[PDB]
Symmetry: D2
Subunit: 334 residues, 4 copies
């Protein structure tokens, strides 16, 4: 007999087991592995599946993770260029494609990553018809729209990682000013994950105290405390970090892990993420951008209606315009 | 014009949710709440259901937990005398029934808790036919047997918390001896969760160093390290705690959470838990007692075969005879 | 020639080291043990010390926790009626004294519990001159004032658990009404942890959306929603739970641990807790009541100044007057 | 008045605070950042400090982590090429230096990395004279010797990550073969973190069942289950992963965090880490290699005396000689 047979006496019939909280990460570059190690660190998946077109690095990442297995709570890790290995995922994180060169706008990536997504979105849905797709690749709003169209999935099951990260950055910068933890700072960056984002100044608050009531000039050009510069640091953050170390990955990895935690624990927590906002704030096309949404096990099930101020609605409309201007030229999507 | 309608714009239609990791704790006493609170503390459930016969205390425990929701990760906590609230439970923990008085053996409770289990076990399976059942009430070995029989579930879905806790206690006393963390001490108490439990001296080791190898008289009357008294402390521990504070609950609630974690995260980790050991070590009947078992999302799917020494095998058989003497006379199971 | 001596070769010479994260809990009742298990399950202490007047209960509780050690990350669990066991604690949580009977106001617990504190507090300060004290016993506001006075510690090191719990409950009720997690609902209950607490309607908000903007009648009697009813449920919660199960413990246990976590990890997070509010909002004496405060490793280092509406300031003055009426007549402090 | 002066009212005076649990990571490469994120994900440090000679990369890594601050529990993240930033670190991880090329042996990296450490280690002890140093850069056993000599620290505060990773790899492969979780398989890979590591077959056990009792040919060349091939996979794993992805980093980050947790929580758990083994198993010189060691807040305070088999003592003495043969010719330490 094998050692296994000497040691192990079966009590159950052997059986094909169906993973419950299977997560797939697509693309195992900087962002993909940031997301993967964050997912594994929070024990969010009982099965992790990696997909990339670079087979050698894909197998290497899978082996490195598997070696850390003693320290994790994920009994199965699997990797393949073939999407069969992503079968029955609850959530598929898509991180594949080109990124920004230094100084380069995410919008300049569209045409390349669109061609990438046309190949990978169908495959996801072939093997995980019931999954939630979290889109990360840039430009994230456009490609969330593109994934929704390409997948034929319900709007609530195709989420763009959107401004979660921008908002996190916002709240850290405010936190650094006030000397309090970021989670005790409340503020929402909305719209495009990019240059046209919108700082909802009217919502920024500590312990229910409106900071715009303490500082009516907050977010104007004439503001002795210059909070416009905080929104600007938020807008420029990606470019500065890309200039310094060539990419960003740890922050987005943590943010994606936060979204996943809200969905798999069925928490119904509110996250600023990218969704179709046709018919709100006067936007008239099928634009995707970040609004506050309720995330739980079903995916994105609600948007929060806000009492945006005039200049804030105007910024949001301009961001919607910038995005639709690129969306309207996107063909061959079904 | 409701504030919820003003505030929330729906994206998906509202649908009826079935929970993924629903756990039910039956009995909301010292042990039941210790279990519920350990379960919530580790975010093991997306839905906790409490069941008891005391409707007032039940709703009170439920409300106190819900008041804690801000600090938890469990969106739905519910409670009811009616087992319909437990439907679709992935795991059901049974803690309901009578407990030991001071000095009282756990076997003394069989008659009463059989009558208890004969009512609740059916109710459980009636509403969650695919669940795993973790028996905690005493005597837990005999009651896991009773539960297996009444439920009609496969033996891999009926689990008795067993000696997980005895072994935790053993490992604590070991680490106290040695100045190491309990998780770096290894040693298994097996057999009855009670006075007939067996210390597997041949398995006791620190970092793969057999301590019986550095002491062939480990566990005997002529033992300079006096390990026998450690096994006696493990055996007497419940009674001592019961005398000092009337009951035990914290360690067992942590134990049961450990088991649930291994099963919900599907780790196939090995725990000394109570299972049907017919055909092992010369035991000829469907005795339930604790052995090392592999636990995962299907439940208790394998037992580990061990090369027990003769004396260990003999204590194990004696423990099986103790239990089977009670089991063989139970009726209408 | 002992087992330890043969198994372990020393690399460092034996020294007595001081714990880095010692927490003491005073009182091992329902609340003290809910606190202990919450602290242990979050691995917030490297040494936990339990103190009570009931020596047997105390030993029993300590033994139960130690028997759970395998599942925990606290290598030292110690218990004694002598406060020498609490020496060098970073945080001391006081949960000792009488609690409310059915329907009893917390302010009716004053004299009894003041006497208790007069003995407990000096002992704490003798053995942990540098600790932060978290007062939990009721009335928590008046007793936080008492502890400040008895101890001689600075204001930033005497913290009343206060309305953290009240707000928790508020946020839970809110979440039930809106169908979101309590953490994504924001709203502040301030003032006394008791009947005169103040719902800060003007701060209530989801995702930065002022709920009193979508509903300016919020908190009045002309309200289509029943928000005042939410605040009333908050006020009555403790009585309702005391009536169903005789006491409350799980939610306050999680609240105390939430505060300890902000402190020990130095996060400077904002919690509504009881501090000395003389000179704010027109309050004229050294009243202790809950405001939103920045907590971290030094303790309670800032209060948040808020733009309370006139009715809110008025309710807060009414709270502070209820409390000061009791305080002013307190002697031998 | 500033917005912050309006918002925040001081309760305590301003004061400079010392981090309680500061960790510095030296080198922000693949491995350094893998360690960094592993430490942050476990909320192991209240202050994280990064050091590297690449100023731009250094600042960028720092900025990324800060932008993740909302999802974390480390309130202060600093970085600089100046070691002033590392002042008062409790633990300093050293990951800086050259790494293996494809197929290259770690020993071939000594010269270059000695020149690294001759600069780095004196800086470290300059600002944290009391710290523990975890050496990760390769060759890790040799560089741990170098760090010990250069730092003038006591042995219990210079720890090489050693075979913690090798054993992790060992256990994973073993779990893969048995269908159980790696934590329920026990097995020690000792000696050099390199081609001369020793597999301690006599300790390999599941639930205390010695697997070399069921397979007495385990470890030999005449073993139909080819356990020696498992040890081979452990020795080759780093080369295979380097050939596939260019380096390894995640598994060692997790291993390092596991060590840090044992020490900062004062758990006294046992890890296979590199210590100075002179006078052990016939080793005559100040060689560093991995044995099972107790780790707690003081550092590496104990080694576990093992009853190795003759062949295993042999492979360990070969490892020692392989190492000392390089160690002995190093200058200016
Ligand atoms: N939403 C956000 O906040 C952020 C978005 N991003 C975006 O994330 C995406 C990736 O960034 P990095 O991880 O640093 O790039 P990376 O180059 O370091 O890794 C990208 C991965 O995509 C893989 N890939 C390309 N086409 C593929 C296909 N058809 N199938 C499978 N794999 C494919 C490449 O092999 C590579 O391994 C980029 O678009 C970047 O702009 C980056 C950071 C934050
Ligand atoms: N396996 C182990 O390691 C341990 C086992 N136990 C056992 O666990 C059990 C619970 O002990 P405690 O929480 O201290 O007793 P407890 O009195 O504090 O609570 C038991 C609960 O069971 C409830 N209950 C009784 N009959 C019921 C019925 N027919 N249906 C529904 N609920 C019913 C009672 O109302 C009570 O609320 C006892 O059997 C005790 O012996 C306790 C400690 C250790
Ligand atoms: N602030 C809050 O949100 C809440 C506060 N509380 C308060 O917490 C306190 C404890 O309530 P419970 O734990 O349910 O009562 P509990 O009756 O279960 O007893 C707590 C312990 O107080 C101990 N004690 C009395 N004098 C002592 C002394 N001099 N030294 C050490 N221990 C002493 C008793 O022996 C008892 O063990 C009460 O004052 C209650 O009002 C309760 C719930 C919430
Ligand atoms: N013990 C173990 O199991 C393992 C050890 N290692 C070792 O980790 C070390 C680093 O590996 P990687 O992160 O992949 O290489 P890396 O090439 O990605 O980054 C190494 C960092 O060291 C920095 N550095 C070089 N000299 C420095 C100095 N004097 N001060 C500060 N920073 C300096 C470089 O700037 C680089 O940024 C290597 O020696 C490698 O062998 C690698 C894997 C596991
Ligand atoms: C895991 N599936 C089998 C579980 C159990 O089957 C068994 C029936 C008898 C025995 C026996 F006889 F003790 F060996 C052992 C097992 C059973 C019995 C009745 C209904 C379902 C399962
Ligand atoms: C950081 N907290 C400041 C220290 C505090 O000092 C006081 C501050 C204010 C007052 C009061 F209330 F104005 F009288 C009284 C004392 C104090 C109180 C008692 C003992 C020591 C310090």
């Amino acid at each position: 007999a094998t050692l296994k047979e000497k040691l192990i006496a079966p009590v159950a019939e052997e059986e094909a087991t169906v993973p419950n909280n299977k997560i797939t990460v697509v693309g195992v570059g900087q962002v993909g592995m940031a997301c993967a190690i964050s997912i594994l660190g929070k024990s969010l998946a009982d099965e992790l599946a990696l997909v990339d077109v670079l087979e050698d690095k894909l197998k290497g990442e899978m082996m490195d993770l598997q070696h850390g297995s003693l320290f994790l709570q994920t009994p199965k890790i699997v990797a393949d260029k073939d999407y069969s290995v992503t079968a029955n995922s609850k959530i598929v994180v898509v991180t594949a494609g080109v990124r920004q060169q230094e100084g380069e706008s995410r919008l300049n990536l569209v045409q390349r990553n669109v061609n990438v997504f046309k190949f990978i979105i169908p495959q996801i849905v072939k093997y995980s018809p019931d999954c939630i797709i979290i889109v990360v690749s840039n430009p994230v709003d456009i490609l969330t729209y593109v994934t929704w169209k390409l997948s034929g999935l319900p709007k609530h099951r195709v989420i763009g990682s959107g401004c979660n990260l921008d908002s996190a950055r916002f709240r850290y910068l405010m936190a650094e000013k006030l000397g309090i933890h970021p989670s005790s700072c409340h503020g929402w960056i909305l719209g495009e994950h990019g240059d046209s984002s919108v700082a909802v100044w009217s919502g920024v608050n500590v312990a229910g105290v409106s900071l715009q009531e303490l500082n009516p000039e907050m977010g104007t050009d004439n503001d002795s405390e210059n909070w416009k510069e905080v929104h600007k640091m938020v807008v420029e953050s990606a470019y500065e970090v890309i200039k310094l170390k060539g990419y960003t990955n740890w922050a987005i990895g943590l943010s994606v892990a936060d979204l996943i935690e809200s969905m798999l624990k069925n928490l119904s927590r509110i996250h600023p993420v990218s969704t179709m906002v046709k018919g709100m704030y006067g936007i008239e096309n099928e634009v995707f951008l970040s609004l506050p949404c309720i995330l739980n096990a079903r995916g994105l099930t609600s948007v929060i209606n806000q009492k945006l101020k005039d200049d804030e609605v105007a910024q949001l409309k301009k961001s919607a315009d910038t995005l639709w201007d690129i969306q309207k030229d996107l063909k061959d999507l079904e």
